[model samples]
Target: SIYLEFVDESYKPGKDEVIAVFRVTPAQGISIKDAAGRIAAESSVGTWTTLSVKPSWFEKLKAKAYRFHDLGDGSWLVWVAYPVELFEEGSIPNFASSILGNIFGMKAIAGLRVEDVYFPPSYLETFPGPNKGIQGVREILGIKDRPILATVPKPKLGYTPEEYGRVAYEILIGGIDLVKDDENFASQPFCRFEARLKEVMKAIDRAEKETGERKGYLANVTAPIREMEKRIKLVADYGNKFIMIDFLTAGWAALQHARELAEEYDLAIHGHRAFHAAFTRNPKHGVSMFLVAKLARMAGVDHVHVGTPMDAKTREVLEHTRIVREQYYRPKEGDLFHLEQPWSNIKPVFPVASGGLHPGTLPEVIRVMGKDIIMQVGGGVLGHPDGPEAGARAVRQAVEAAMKGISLDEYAREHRELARALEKWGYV
Candidate 1:
């Protein structure tokens, strides 16, 4: 009874409706429509077994599998529309549970991947978007044109607080505007959280004074929810301007709570999508990273890692990057099943291009991703034969070359640090 109610090929989704697009593959001998209907029902109000007595008003609230398109292979593009009432306002975890939670384990479906989500205006306005969005971040750095540069100290772990601080100072003074804590570098026995913060702040101050440039740190504050709150306050007390969180691992509820706290303290939130590939790497099943980026902006992260173009990325990953960077996007005709989203009043998020990036590859990264991004280089800055300070200078030199539309070789002739970097790692 419920399955029949869920299928309606003629039904059209409304502007106020929340829609989800899923890529599904049914088990052998199972009809695609039937499997799609079951998915919609199971995720919403329907169960595997028919109920003897159903509510009189149940028909009005049921989800509808309105569109099903065959890709000619075993998979199908299924669009399910759910009434806004089915979800709790301002709750990403609840929203995820409804669309991405159940139905993946169903016997009838062999594979299911959440491709995209289209939240209506009523739902988008409920949460606090980025506090210091693209423009706000630019204002803070007093930079209007080129991309912001950032770096992480090498040997992601194993450094004492004092040792890490010294490295941070070198990189910052050399040219980088932000020094970050790697995803895995939390409060360890050697680098206790409190001590690390104190040392890093001293490094930031020293760098700012020496370079006459404002510098910041993306200090990782990811921990248990309660511990995370304490870290946030500590960062505020130290007068730091930004705080980092491993958003995927911290969970949406924790991220939302952190966003609220950051707003109160006037700090910018940097989101690291740690542990995302567990689902995003697979093309046939699990959720896409695009959804993660969208939700991160809605949850108020000023910038989020959207993958780098320096590496050989698939079309899907590139598309995800575009969606994250743009405030309003409608895919061109004949595009993949990606949904069009107008962020409305939601502030646009700065996309971060990182991972195996160096000065040699900086031009290509800017060419593909444009200037509204954070160019985060770790080994590229720290592993330079000349040293970390020179490494930082090389990265900044690379940025200048790209912005000026000059060749790296040409620019390097005038800047020795960049020339040394080019010799160590040839231009891509």
Candidate 2:
């Protein structure tokens, strides 16, 4: 009876309601109506069976599967609208536990993917959003015209603290604005966190002095809560303006806690989507990276890796950028099932285009994504035959060329570093 009651096609979601769009495939023999109701019920206020006795006010709190559109592929696009009271104010963990928690495991649904969410302004204002956001980050770096350049040392690991510092100094002085620790390089025996911090800070200080340009480090502080707090404090103490975290692996609750600590320290948080591929990789099931990017911004990460258009999903890349940078967005035709979100009071996030990118690819990345991005190149900078410094120079040269509306080939003729980079990694 409750399952049947949960499906109300005539129900209209209130202005203050939190809406979710799920791509659901019901199990064999299960009616779409039954599956949709079960999802809404399981995610909100229902059990396996109707309760023997329930509160009179339970009807008001129940989530309703307000709409369902058949995709004709055995899957349906289901819309569930929940009362704002279903989620605790200012808690991402609580919000996620409701919409993204129990519904996935329901036996009635064979495949489920949370495609999008429409957060009411009341619920959005509960979170801090991004601390440094797009403008804040641009202001800190003092670069107004071009995309911010960032790089990770090649090999990603096995470099001792001193060796790491040396390479970082070269990259910073050469051209890049930020040097980041790879996602997996945290507190290892060979490169302990404390020692790495000490060495890297010294490098940052020296690079700033020499380059006379504002440079920062996205120091990886992704660890257990206590260790992460310690790392955050250590970075703050060293006067670093930024720190990095693996958003998915570190957990949403952990990220929220880390965001709080980062806000306290006045450090910008850079989010790395390390374990996202496991869920986001599957198109038919699990959560989407678009949701991941939105949550990262809501959790107050200044920037998050959204993947490059070269290798990843183009629509996902564009949507991630839009969700992070725009205050309000309407999905284009043929796009995934997404509601237009008015991100009131939620500061815009800076989308970082990373993975398999280099100097040659910089122009197209800037052309497509615009200047409001963090362009991170690893092998593109490190694998240059000329070394990391030249690699960094080449990357920066490419950025300058793109900004000036000059071709990389033409720019390379005047700049040998760009020429070498182009020779090694041809322009995209």
Residue-by-residue lDDT tens digits, candidate 1, 44-119: 8775456688676566668999998888889999999998888888999988888988888889889999988998
Q: Give the TM-score of candidate 2.
A: 0.96
Query: Which lDDT tens digits does candidate 2 get at residues 1-428?
Result: 55988889998987789999999999999999999989988888875455687667577778999898889898999999999888898898898898889888888889999999889998889999988888888888888878998988877898999999898998898889999999998898999999999998899889889888899999999999999999999999999989999988999988899889978988899988888888887767899888888888888999988776844478668888998899998898766577888888988988898878878888888988989999987777878788888888888898999999998888889999889888887965
Name the regions of candidate 2 deviating beyond 4 angstroms.
47-56, 310-312, 334-336
* Alpha-carbon deviation at 46 in model 1, angstroms: 1.8
lDDT (CA) for every model shown? 0.87, 0.88
lDDT value, residue 162 of candidate 1: 87
Model 1 CA lDDT for position 238: 97
- In order of listing, the candidates' clash counts read 0, 0
lDDT of 1 at 43: 81
